[PDB]
Symmetry: C4
Subunit: 364 residues, 4 copies
Amino acid sequence: DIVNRKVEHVEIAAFENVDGLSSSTFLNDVILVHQGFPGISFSEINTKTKFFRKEISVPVMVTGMTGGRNELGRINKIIAEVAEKFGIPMGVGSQRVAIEKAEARESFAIVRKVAPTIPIIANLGMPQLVKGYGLKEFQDAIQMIEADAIAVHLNPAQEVFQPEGEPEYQIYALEKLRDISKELSVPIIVKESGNGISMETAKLLYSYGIKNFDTSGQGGTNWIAIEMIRDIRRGNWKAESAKNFLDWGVPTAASIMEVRYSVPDSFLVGSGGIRSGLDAAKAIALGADIAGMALPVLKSAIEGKESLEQFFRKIIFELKAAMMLTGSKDVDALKKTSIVILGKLKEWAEYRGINLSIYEKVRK
Amino acid sequence: DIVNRKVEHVEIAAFENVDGLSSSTFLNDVILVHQGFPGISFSEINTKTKFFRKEISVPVMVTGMTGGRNELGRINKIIAEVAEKFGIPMGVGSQRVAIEKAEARESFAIVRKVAPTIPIIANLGMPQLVKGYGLKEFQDAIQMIEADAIAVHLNPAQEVFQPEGEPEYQIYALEKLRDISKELSVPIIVKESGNGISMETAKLLYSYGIKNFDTSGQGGTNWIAIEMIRDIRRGNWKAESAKNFLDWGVPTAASIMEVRYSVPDSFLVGSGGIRSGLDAAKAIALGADIAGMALPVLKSAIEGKESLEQFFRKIIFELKAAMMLTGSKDVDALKKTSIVILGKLKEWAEYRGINLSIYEKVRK
Amino acid sequence: DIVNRKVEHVEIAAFENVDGLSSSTFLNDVILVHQGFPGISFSEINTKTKFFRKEISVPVMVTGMTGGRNELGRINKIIAEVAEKFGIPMGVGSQRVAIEKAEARESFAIVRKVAPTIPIIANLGMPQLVKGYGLKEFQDAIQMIEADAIAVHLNPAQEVFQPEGEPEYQIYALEKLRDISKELSVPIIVKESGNGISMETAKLLYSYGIKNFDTSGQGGTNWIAIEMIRDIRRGNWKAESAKNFLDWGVPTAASIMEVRYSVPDSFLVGSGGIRSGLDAAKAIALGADIAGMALPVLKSAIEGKESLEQFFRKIIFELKAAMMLTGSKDVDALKKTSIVILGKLKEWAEYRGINLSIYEKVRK
Amino acid sequence: DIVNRKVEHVEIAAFENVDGLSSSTFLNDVILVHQGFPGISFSEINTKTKFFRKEISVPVMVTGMTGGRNELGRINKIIAEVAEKFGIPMGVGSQRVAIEKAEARESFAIVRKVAPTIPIIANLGMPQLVKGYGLKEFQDAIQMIEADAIAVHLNPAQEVFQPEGEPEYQIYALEKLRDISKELSVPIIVKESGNGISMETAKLLYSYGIKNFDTSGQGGTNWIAIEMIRDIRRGNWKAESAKNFLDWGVPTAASIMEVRYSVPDSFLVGSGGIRSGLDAAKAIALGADIAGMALPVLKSAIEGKESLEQFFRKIIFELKAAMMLTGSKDVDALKKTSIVILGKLKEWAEYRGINLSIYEKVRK
Ligand SMILES: Cc1cc2nc3c(=O)[nH]c(=O)nc-3n(C[C@H](O)[C@H](O)[C@H](O)COP(=O)(O)O)c2cc1C
Ligand SMILES: Cc1cc2nc3c(=O)[nH]c(=O)nc-3n(C[C@H](O)[C@H](O)[C@H](O)COP(=O)(O)O)c2cc1C
Ligand SMILES: Cc1cc2nc3c(=O)[nH]c(=O)nc-3n(C[C@H](O)[C@H](O)[C@H](O)COP(=O)(O)O)c2cc1C
Ligand SMILES: Cc1cc2nc3c(=O)[nH]c(=O)nc-3n(C[C@H](O)[C@H](O)[C@H](O)COP(=O)(O)O)c2cc1C
Ligand code: DMA
Ligand code: DMA
Ligand code: DMA
Ligand code: DMA
Ligand SMILES: [Mg+2]
Ligand SMILES: [Mg+2]
Ligand SMILES: [Mg+2]
Ligand SMILES: [Mg+2]
């Protein structure tokens, strides 16, 4: 019933009120400057971009979500087969459960069966690095789905409020991670889980050789909220404490700036409450290399394959519309299109010593 | 039934909820400084100003709206005959439909019949320049109403979400436009359609010899909203994507600043959600040479001639009041009266590198 | 029935919704810094201050309001006899009506009968200076109540929307005013009427020898609103235009700054929506020499003598509390106590080039 | 029935609507930067800190509240015995009543009986120093509970609106306080009472040798509100005046900055509307040495011992969570962890000349 937590996560995320609960992406404060004369035609817009060694159709990825059981695997199947069809990369949920129990291995292995060509991304938790995971468990997760990269997740917020949570993040784990990167065939992405990557955390990770980040800021799926609900449900007293932390974290937009600024040469996924292609566009324009999505993908896949195919169409169209309307012929042009940064995001950046002049240069 | 789109545009704009829907002019953030001692009498205020080669009574124009059918032409008739009476210039709707079908030619030609002296402004769409329009179609549109100028419209936003939309804006079209200006007897205005002119777009247009701009920013008629409604109505899936773009664009006030700043010597109409003579006053004060109106004129003309005559009286009075209360004896004095720029418009201008010092100089 | 407008003004102001209607003082944005150790006792706080040649008990005045009829004069009687008792100066309403009709002379003359010692301030409208008033009409108004000063009022906003309004403010009127000051035995105050004095207006007035100003900014009695109501009532079409100007003007707080800054050595009444002793305190602290009130005094006087005596007690106490809690032993100490300027007032001051450094110096 | 005021204070504070009534801590504007990789384990977080000569378990204190009667003493008993159990320091309510009546001495003396080891802090009012309290009354208060320090309270705000209030704060009282510190065996803390310490007040107190401050800013228990309620209840006319001052004071967060900045080397309690361990965390991070609480401790103690034990667990956990999620191994690390200062708090600090650069340095 670490597999029970797995179904509870999906069940709450999908059907309960946790999307952006008391949180904010700050994407509100980002405005793409409209170009009344785009200088391009809609049909010649090229959404292709690179994702490590492969090429992907759209600068969007599905980030890690689930696995560890049947109904969980058949979700992963729906996601993967559609992701394949659209040429967009897919992460899988934490593979811990598949390392601990061989029955859960199938619900992850299905992904590569049904999606042979797209980038697939493994997933293990940072806490497990403190609790005696090493080179072989990583290679396990990797070869189990023939992953093109592995995502190690940061979730100290969640672990703290989780009823069975493991809030251990000793510096030792980074020495280990860095050694494991020596021996690994594929690159590592470090990703948060709804609470965002600060420039301190980015710089630290970078100092240990981490080059790929996934922001996962607040404003999307509220993981403190999900554990709060699990806490309420067990009459665990932590529930009320969690309530005080519902807006803890770096908002996604702020995280994107923070990471891009503190480690310019990084490969950067901008995720955490990306809900439309416009949001994807803003995130990329703001500094991300690719935009990441979880929850809305889950909600669609639960409704069935074509429901999700319609979702990706809507996202892709939206993105292309933002590109069109900024005169951005391809992903590179979008990355350097004109933006306005307003309100709280501005105040944030200024206080954190993010120089708006030198920032415009770093993003391009 | 490109004529059907023409009636549907009028029918939605006039009777459905699209005026400023999730959009904003930012005119809110503009404050005309009250002068307790004006230094003038109300009766000596002179609202006269030049409009290319003619002189107009008020620094206000009715911008292009409709034509292509009977009930559409009898609207144009009401507008034009009232515009004439008040000595205010009038643009007509897109003349594409009249180029394609000779029956629609009457609904445009009526305008010059009933309004012999005021500036009348022709209208063709930018996409048509990529789709084989040229010198002769322009001269057609012009001589068809004995136009004093022709407005070429930017509507990539609209075209994108339009169900039958043509979102093609290749750079070629500007090379063509620039050549057509060589041969044309009247000047060209480039205008947007509810989404605004950025300083990048202004500068580009200017580099092709365009000197007359009509901002048409967001915060008035929401053209994305109108197409969304047409999409909902056809059960076209684009409807929901459109919903995400309802606040896409440059707000009018911001656009005025952007144009005036990036191309100081421009002749500049400030339009997009101008609803009162106070709005007109702000737009002029802010940097516009003349203020532009569409939707409220439509709504009045639909109610009848005198309903619209009362409207122009209200607008004029309001304008004169703002002039009086700023001690502005004439349109020139208004253009350099004292203002305050606040809130989001300030943040916008700062981020976009609009120097408030050097701006005050350019508008004065 | 210029006497009828007099009754209607009181009747609307007193019983209808016009106090701060869509307007704002910006006093919100002014904060008096609390001193946990004041350094004084409440009982030793000295509220005394000078008012031209006289001394007054409190740095507060009742500004001009009414007269011209019986029920209007018996209001002036209640106000005056209470003002006398409290040693606070009182302005009277416009004396135009008393110049035009000798029956109205009594409703003004009563004031000096019942208030022999306090400063009484005469009142005439600026428009009348263009319409043939001069030295003798001024001396009339003065000697009619043995005034210690005369207030000439600026009301171009009001006159514009007034149904029988006279919006004439030629520069000639200042040449005349300046000559009339030559021959007058008492000083002149120029005051606005709900719409505030800008720094341009202040400077202009100053260049004609005017040294005493009464801000009367927006956020209090909305005089555009009052005339709008009169308009609605006569089915006058101006009603709707007025509605668009409901928030026209300089907010009181801004006006105080603007005047103090542009003419440092001025004697300055801060009025326009002063509703509590805290408001009075903020206004003085901000830069006013004395605080001015109209509407709330009217409303109390209408309820009877003791109702108004209780009002002045409440005001005085409130003021003293603010003085106590800022460690301000007397009016001078309050004028230089510590403040915070926030929000929109700050943005206003910055845009209008009011240097916050050099401002803090000027207000001391 | 100065003991009646004691019962009324508790009875209103506890059961009526006065917590943060029209007031604000500004803690909203303080954001602790989330660290996705903390670099520590939750279990190795050390919350210990020094409190004068003693060491305390948590950087939190219960600030002074009550005493003077039986049901008041049995509250003090519950608080103290729990405070003891958790190793957190406790202040007692004003000991005036125990100096005046020997029956009230028991309700204070109980505290040291049931809490032998924790720091206990005496309490006397600043007004009593002008009304002939001296060395011996201080030593009385101290030895009556074997206090480790004495808090003298600033409450001019309260005294002003109190029906039986004594608003006397002559400078003389500081000369006296300073002399009394000569002869006293324990240190003196100066604390406010819901209205905050300004940098002027801090500097003044410091110039008289005061080194320990307790901010007690607005946004928590509204003492003006409490006296307002007492006023309403006695039909005292001051009630309405009080209403106008409900948001008078320095917001806690602002006060913390102001004190830390004006007197860097101070020992500083940050109190006034601290309601969660997150609030405690923010206050310490911001500049406080320890966080202070009153009202929520009262409310729990009223419900019984274990209700309050649960409360302290909740607070401690919350605090440790904030520490964890900022990678703060101990109280010192938290004091120098990364923050963002936004909105009104930023505007406040800027206007008050608090240099954000030189501030970041002072807080570490
Ligand atoms: C049901 C669900 C389970 C998830 N589980 C995982 C996990 O196993 N590992 C992980 O790194 N991310 C996990 N995520 C977090 C996402 O990858 C993502 O970083 C975060 O939810 C923010 O994106 P969103 O707001 O678009 O969902 C999960 C999200 C959802 C909705
Ligand atoms: C019913 C209607 C039809 C319009 N059609 C056209 C068009 O043919 N060509 C064009 O350049 N502008 C067109 N406009 C846009 C206006 O000229 C104007 O730029 C825009 O609506 C913003 O102004 P408003 O908010 O005052 O309406 C149309 C507006 C309306 C309301
Ligand atoms: C009923 C009434 C009549 C007034 N008439 C006059 C007038 O005769 N002359 C004048 O200078 N001010 C006049 N005032 C304006 C006030 O002196 C004051 O400047 C303005 O009302 C703002 O103050 P308040 O908001 O505290 O009323 C009048 C105000 C009221 C309420
Ligand atoms: C019932 C009650 C009585 C209090 N009485 C005292 C007092 O005797 N002396 C004092 O210095 N502080 C007194 N306080 C004020 C607190 O010590 C504290 O400074 C203030 O309430 C702000 O903290 P809070 O918002 O956490 O309650 C009292 C607070 C409460 C709730
Ligand atoms: C958002 C996120 C990281 C979800 C997985 O949490 P978990 O603690 O259930 O993962 P694991 O199975 O690694 O404990
Ligand atoms: C606001 C605006 C430009 C309306 C005309 O759009 P359209 O696409 O119907 O014009 P055309 O007839 O040129 O296609
Ligand atoms: C607020 C104010 C100035 C009221 C008097 O206006 P008015 O135009 O009735 O005065 P007058 O009697 O001078 O015309
Ligand atoms: C918040 C606070 C200081 C409460 C005690 O006030 P009080 O005036 O009842 O105290 P004392 O007993 O010293 O008069
Ligand atoms: Mg886990
Ligand atoms: Mg078109
Ligand atoms: Mg008049
Ligand atoms: Mg007391």
